[PDB]
Paper text:
Human APE1 is an essential enzyme and multifunctional nuclease with AP-endonuclease, 3′ phosphodiesterase, 3′ to 5′ exonuclease, and RNA cleavage activities. Instead, rAPs are processed by AP-Endonuclease 1 (APE1), a multifunctional enzyme in the base excision repair (BER) pathway. During BER, abasic (AP) sites are first processed by APE1, which cleaves 5′ of the abasic site generating 3′ hydroxyl and 5′ deoxyribose phosphate termini. Here, we utilize enzyme kinetics, X-ray crystallography, and molecular dynamics simulations to provide insight into rAP processing by APE1.
Residue numbers in the entry: 43 to 125, 127 to 318
The structure:
């Protein structure tokens, strides 16, 4: 039932040393995560790029302790216009060539869920996909968002190879959560949401970085409900992903689940690429 993430492979199949380390983390309340020592974890992990989802913190209440990461000094933030209910961030060692926010339909919406950062040799998207909600009350919104997102990403990755990370709010296959059969009618594992993720991989196309390396590893999760003691009993879901263009698979050194790192009801994930 438990899971121990394999050790970090810092060399590509071709044999190159990893040159870029990206960490993605749903902090589920940036300010509380900061009080639970999340920045201490990040400083130890020392990623070149850090992506954060569900910040639930407006741009103006951002603790200046984030300024205390000069190793990740270029910081971009995407807060909603309506809501602390969502929000995402991207911090990198080097300035991206260009940073954008949203997926094009910010008229009447602007939910604060996506940052697009263009780097020298690839484009990174971080996303906090809308949860379909308890009793699927937001599933219809989720399906329309999936469609727009796929379309938006299609007209993005035809220029440079793409990395996409974040809380995608779906367990793709039954090997991606602990209770598949009790959850087929729950947000994260409906047939429609599993279909959208399949369509995402097909249409862009993207490869699931973790499952590309560990197709047969079970019990690998990145989210556990705070309730019961689901984290302790590894009753989890894998909702957080690094998705890669096929162009990038020969650079893929490893894709980590940082199961032990506390501070949220998700744990960090870490990507190594040899670029």
């Amino acid at each position: 039932a438990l899971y121990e993430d394999p050790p970090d492979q810092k060399t590509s199949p071709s044999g190159k040393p990893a040159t870029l380390k990206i960490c993605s983390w749903n902090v589920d309340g940036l300010r509380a995560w900061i009080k639970k020592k999340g920045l201490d974890w990040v400083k130890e992990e020392a990623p070149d790029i850090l992506c954060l989802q569900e910040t639930k913190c407006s741009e103006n209440k951002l603790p200046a302790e984030l300024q205390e990461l000069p190793g990740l000094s270029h910081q971009y933030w995407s807060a909603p216009s309506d809501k602390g209910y969502s929000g995402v961030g991207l911090l990198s060692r080097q300035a991206p060539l260009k940073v954008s926010y949203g997926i094009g339909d910010e008229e009447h919406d602007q939910e604060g869920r996506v940052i697009v950062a263009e780097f020298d040799s690839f484009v990174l998207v971080t996303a906090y996909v809308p949860n379909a909600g308890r009793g699927l009350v937001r599933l219809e919104y989720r399906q329309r968002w999936d469609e727009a997102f796929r379309k938006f990403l299609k007209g993005l990755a035809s220029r440079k190879p793409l990395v996409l990370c974040g809380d995608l709010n779906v367990a793709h296959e039954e090997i991606d959560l602990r209770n598949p059969k009790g959850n087929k009618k729950n947000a994260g594992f409906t047939p429609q949401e599993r279909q959208g993720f399949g369509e995402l991989l097909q249409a862009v196309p993207l490869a699931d970085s973790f499952r590309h390396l560990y197709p047969n590893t079970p019990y690998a999760y990145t989210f556990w409900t705070y309730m019961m003691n689901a984290r302790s009993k590894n009753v989890g879901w894998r909702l957080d992903y690094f998705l890669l263009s096929h162009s990038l698979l020969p650079a893929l050194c490893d894709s980590k689940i940082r199961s032990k790192a506390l501070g949220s009801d998700h744990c960090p994930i870490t990507l190594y690429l040899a670029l």
